[PDB]
Point group: D2
Chain length 215, copies 4
Amino acid sequence: VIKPDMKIKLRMEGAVNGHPFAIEGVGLGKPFEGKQSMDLKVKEGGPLPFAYDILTTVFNRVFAKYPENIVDYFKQSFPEGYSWERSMNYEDGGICNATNDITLDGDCYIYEIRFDGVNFPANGPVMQKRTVKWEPSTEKLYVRDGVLKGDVNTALSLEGGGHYRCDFKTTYKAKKVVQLPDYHFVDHHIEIKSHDKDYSNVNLHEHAEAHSGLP
Amino acid sequence: VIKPDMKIKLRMEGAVNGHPFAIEGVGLGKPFEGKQSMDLKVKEGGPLPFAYDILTTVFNRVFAKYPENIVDYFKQSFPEGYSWERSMNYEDGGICNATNDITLDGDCYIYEIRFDGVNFPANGPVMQKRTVKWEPSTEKLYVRDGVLKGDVNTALSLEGGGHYRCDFKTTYKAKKVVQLPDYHFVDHHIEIKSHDKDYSNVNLHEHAEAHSGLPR
Amino acid sequence: VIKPDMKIKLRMEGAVNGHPFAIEGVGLGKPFEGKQSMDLKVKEGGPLPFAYDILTTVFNRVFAKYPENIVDYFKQSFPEGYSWERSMNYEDGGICNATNDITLDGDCYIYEIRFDGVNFPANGPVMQKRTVKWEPSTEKLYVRDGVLKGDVNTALSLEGGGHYRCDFKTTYKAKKVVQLPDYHFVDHHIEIKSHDKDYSNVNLHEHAEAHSGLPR
Amino acid sequence: VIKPDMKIKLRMEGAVNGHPFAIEGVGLGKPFEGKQSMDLKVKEGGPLPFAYDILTTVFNRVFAKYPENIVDYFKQSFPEGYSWERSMNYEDGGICNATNDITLDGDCYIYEIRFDGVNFPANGPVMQKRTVKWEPSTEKLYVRDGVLKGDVNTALSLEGGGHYRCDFKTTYKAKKVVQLPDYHFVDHHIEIKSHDKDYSNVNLHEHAEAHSGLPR
């Protein structure tokens, strides 16, 4: 059911500071190597007046290399799939809520994504597009109330140097009951490899691997 | 432009824990008395699987009695109108983002509302519908970056007694430049006066008054 | 047990960003009128390198005017007294934890106070002494697990204009069993009425009154 | 200045929910291997009425294995030493502020530690001593305003299963000017290896290693 090489299909509908937009994407990846890439196209609301970086971690933990000694919640959840919900709380009060309902059709994951950001100040690095990239990160995953939670405090590096912090709170929900993992981590590194001037086209990559921390 | 008796017409589109819904409303109010009421009807996604109370403060600070000695940001903002953005962060990690774009057509305010809540635990008072009402509240308003901010830490009373807290952070953006007020407060009291069994129909009231705190 | 005119004696021991200090105070107040004042003297760690204002709300809800229909948790607690704990979470990450153990000797309240703030940025308004005063506030009080909680989102006005926001979280613990009140509010207004240049001497006032929100 | 085998001596003075206590410790470690251990003995305020685990991460990032390609803020700071401040914000509102002033005497680091926790609910896992251990963690470290910051969201495992979250926010301050590192991480694993019944004696270990994230 999960192949060494899978495809990605997605559409995001959303708004930032009340201004709506829509983006579609097509991609591919290797679930067992924890690598994926995709091409994203702004379909409505362009040119986006906010930093594209706030969207990229919304554009699937099945693309993560899990060692055998860590129960894999995400690969278990297919073919039925899973959904996830997330709050991304930035240190200047800007907050983005996002959801992704992930289904599987043949060799293609299909994402239905909603994205809603509020309270980004006009002079902040998001509305002024002063972000460079997400730093690499280490997400902490743990079970609560029969579902899987993922917490990570990460940051975006800024143009003049320095960092703009964001607290992630994700809830992962398999559509069918699967074996629940113990406390573990997922190392991430997400990168915009290329983009045109107004980010109408974005080539996005992510590399992720699970581990259990220092012994 | 601001008349003693005004109407309200609205539509909210949104989702809670990824499940979409839509609600429409009609109402009326007296902006100079700070009172309003409305009838709300679920149009899509019913019956709502979550506590209706999380929606009610999203269903307009123009309906607030402002004394003469306190600058009224909201009544100034019309006829053009204003918009607002808000995050409502509950103490168990449930978080709701909402926007309202408010325009004026004759004597009727028109609301275009988006509402998105996530991370409400299945065990929680929201998803299990254990909330009774919002307590009265006192919102704090202050200027930042040429717009008006509103912060308030309030709570919902629960079925078994006790309270479930929520931190509101609102940003108010007048569509054209208006005079900015000093630090002040707005007392709120919102109540569902009636509803049918699954809250497909809700009659909602709010009373709000601005003041400058002690003294008096 | 609580006479119309009472006295205040206190000692605060504490630290800010690892720098220790100590302050003593003597004062007086009217519990039923909700008013108090005191003179405070820095004994150790002077001259204080941080904004004095972060200390002032730590320098007793017995000094709050309670209406007859709102149960008074604090006046009930004496002669035995009560204690409280508080986190004050400022918007730039500076955090002050404080405790006050309040006893009664004759007509004098005695406070034993601890205060510890960390992570105040060197360039912030606290370490650069850019605060003007606390705005008036409205605290929300409610019962949790048999004790009394107090939440308030308030702010300090800044020298260059604007406000520096702070979230208060207080737990009030009566030393004896008392009647618990319903959800209610206390309006505050604390003011430094006078001070010398480096705040070695400070005359501090507070006015507070409880209420149940709208209406009136 | 930093030798492969060094000693540790510390004293912590502090309070939890307003109840004061004191602990002293002697230990040893290998700064270049990122490993340390110590024996801690409660001197005042025993038996401790709260979960000992909230103290353990307060009981020195010089004990972290830094690869050659990541600037070592902490080893640079000696012989003068450094200080740090930290807030530990637990998900149920319990908050601990802590400071450590670290000096060097010969081959022995000397810690002067203050620790203050407030608002831990009586029925929570801390006051009820339901914590088992800290999970391993990954701290993230970054420069701000010329000093070093460390944020990590980690958790304690609980006796009945499940986890108890805590947000760490640390500021590290070298007493002298050192070279500042880029954004990086430190993996931690702290463990109580042994303790007596009321935790009057505790044997504590920590293993820590710096890295720059994926890959490797």
